[PDB]
Amino acid sequence: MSELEKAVVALIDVFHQYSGREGDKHKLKKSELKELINNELSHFLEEIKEQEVVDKVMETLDSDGDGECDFQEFMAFVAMITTACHEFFEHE
Amino acid sequence: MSELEKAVVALIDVFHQYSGREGDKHKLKKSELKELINNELSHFLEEIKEQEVVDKVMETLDSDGDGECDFQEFMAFVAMITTACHEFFEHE
């Protein structure tokens, strides 16, 4: 329910930083993307926590729209991650 | 920051319903997708609120992975929407 729109109004804030927290405008880089998973998904700070997904979570981090992670990207990759991390998404 | 992972743990909950709130397993349909934007982004309940985006927000709702909106999809489309709605994403 609203949990999504509200979580959505929160990302517009996350990008605000993740996008303009160094110099880029509204996009990100394979490096900032990592911070996005380490500054929010500490569980992945270890990564090993998920070897099969470490392959998936990384399968995208290596591409990231090939270049920088823009608006629908951080929300995307973060999604490909969170979904492959530990939660409802596929049991957990 | 964490605002994203936490908002991420919230979507795993949103899908739980949006995905298994009728019969489907972990996916959605152009119809449930609408509820996802109307049950959270009331502002779009009117849609007219954004004619140019109503075209975009809909440009995806019509495709939605062509069929059903799965995990990375709701997070995706909801993103394409929220980003084209009113927030940091492109000024607002």
Read off the tokens for B14: 């949103």
Q: What is the three-class DSSP state of A85?
A: coil
Residue B90 labelled as part of a binding site: no
Burial degree of B71 (CB within 10 A; 0-12, 13-18, 19+): buried
B91 known ligand binder? yes
- Judge whether A86 is annotated as a binding position: yes
> Number of C-alpha atoms within 13 angstroms, CB side, residue B23?
1
Residue of B nearest to A73 (CA): B76
Is some CB atom of chain A closer than 8 A to the CB atom of B90? yes
Tokens of A58: 């990384």
Pick from A11, A37, A42, A49 the residue to mutate for testing the B interface (most B CBs within 10 Å).
A11
Number of domains into which chain B is organized = 1
Secondary structure (3-state) at A9: helix
Q: Does A79 touch chain B (CB under 8 A)?
A: yes
What is the secondary structure of chain B as a DSSP string? Answer: -THHHHHHHHHHHHHHHHHHSSS-SS--BHHHHHHHHHTT-HHHHH-GGGHHHHHHHHHHHTTTTTSB--HHHHHHHHHHHHHHSSSSTT--
CA-nearest of A68, A61, A76 to A11 is: A76
Nearest CA in chain A to B40: A2
**CA-based nearest residue to B39, from B54, B24, B18, B10:** B18
Residue range(s) defining the domain that contains residue B11:
1-92
As a whole number of angstroms, the distance between CA A56 and CA A4 comes to: 24
A14, A19, A75: residue with CB nearest B3: A14
Residues of A in contact with B39 (CB under 8 A): 1-2
Which has the closest alpha carbon to A65: A48, A85, A80, A83?
Answer: A80
Distances (CA, A) of A9 to A47, B20, B88: 27, 25, 8
Angstrom CA distances, B49 to A4, A74, B41, B83, stand at 19, 25, 11, 14
Q: How was this structure determined?
A: NMR
A39 touches chain B (CB under 8 A): yes
Q: Measured between alpha carbons, how far is A27 from A33 in angstroms, rounded to an integer? A: 10
Residue in chain B lying closest to A20 (CA): B88
* CATH number of residue A2's parent domain: 1.10.238.10
How far apart are alpha carbons B92 and B85 in whole angstroms?
A: 7
